[PDB]
């Protein structure tokens with residue numbers, strides 16, 4: 001467990017601002033509903049494990065020591081998404097948006113396309 005606060009996420013996701021048409025308040029909203037802002041969120045559900053603040057699965061995007069069938073499109077080890085530096089997470093997230101789009105994150109369409117004003121930080 002290692003969470004950031006809304007305002008910290010707003011500071012650390014600065015590169016994604018505008019990328020793929022998605023604003024910062026959408027990403028701040030999306031990520032709360034995706035991982036609670038916890039950089040070491042790990043969720044195994046059935047056939048895949050999902051890592052970090054962005055919940056990137058070891059199925060298509062990264063290499064996992066316990067799943068050799070991965071496509072590893074991000075060409076990285078999934079554990080590098082469990083640390084405190086979101087620099088590479090952001091790189092992976094740009095490849096996902098290139099290939100799949102922001103709808104990889106279900107909270108976006110469901111809870112974060114409307115009324116983004118509460119997700120603001122002038123702090």
Ligand SMILES: [Ca+2]
Pocket residue numbers: 080081082083084085086087088089
């Ligand atoms: Ca990282």
